[PDB]
Design a protein around this ligand. Structure first.
Ligand SMILES: [Mg+2]
Length: 141
């Protein structure tokens, strides 16, 4: 794996191990080809829009690879494990730790000095299935 791929995969697994019964991810070359193509074509507008593809997806603007994973994960501060499910400010975290997700692949592209890096990670199987959060988003162990 490349330095970007290794550091990003490692950051996912460092976080997932903090949670009960959550296995590590592996890198997928096909997922990364998908994500890097979307990163290649990103319009550097400052707006984050999902690709609408078949995989799970996390997006960030202004962080390198590992720092993006860190920011996604830090949404745990808004997650109420007593009331699991989706919210606009927890969906990145729940995809990072989604138990049934087994593979991740990501891409990156600079958007200049005013935006920093655009980072997209694609996930297979996808996370954030409504009604399945309790089975796939475990509490801190
Ligand atoms: Mg996103």
């Amino acid at each position: 794996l490349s330095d970007f791929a290794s550091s990003v995969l490692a950051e996912h697994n460092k976080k997932r191990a903090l949670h009960k019964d959550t296995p590590a991810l592996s890198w997928s070359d096909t997922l990364a080809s998908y994500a890097q193509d979307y990163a290649d074509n990103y319009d550097c507008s400052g707006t984050l829009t999902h690709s609408g593809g078949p995989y799970g997806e996390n997006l960030a603007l202004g962080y390198d690879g590992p720092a993006a994973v860190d920011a996604w994960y830090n949404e745990i501060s808004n997650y109420d494990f007593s009331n699991p499910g989706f919210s606009s400010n927890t969906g990145h975290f729940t995809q990072v730790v989604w138990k049934s997700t087994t593979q991740v692949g990501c891409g990156i592209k600079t958007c200049g000095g005013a935006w920093g890096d655009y980072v997209i990670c694609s996930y297979d199987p996808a996370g954030n299935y409504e009604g399945e959060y309790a089975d796939n988003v475990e509490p801190l162990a």
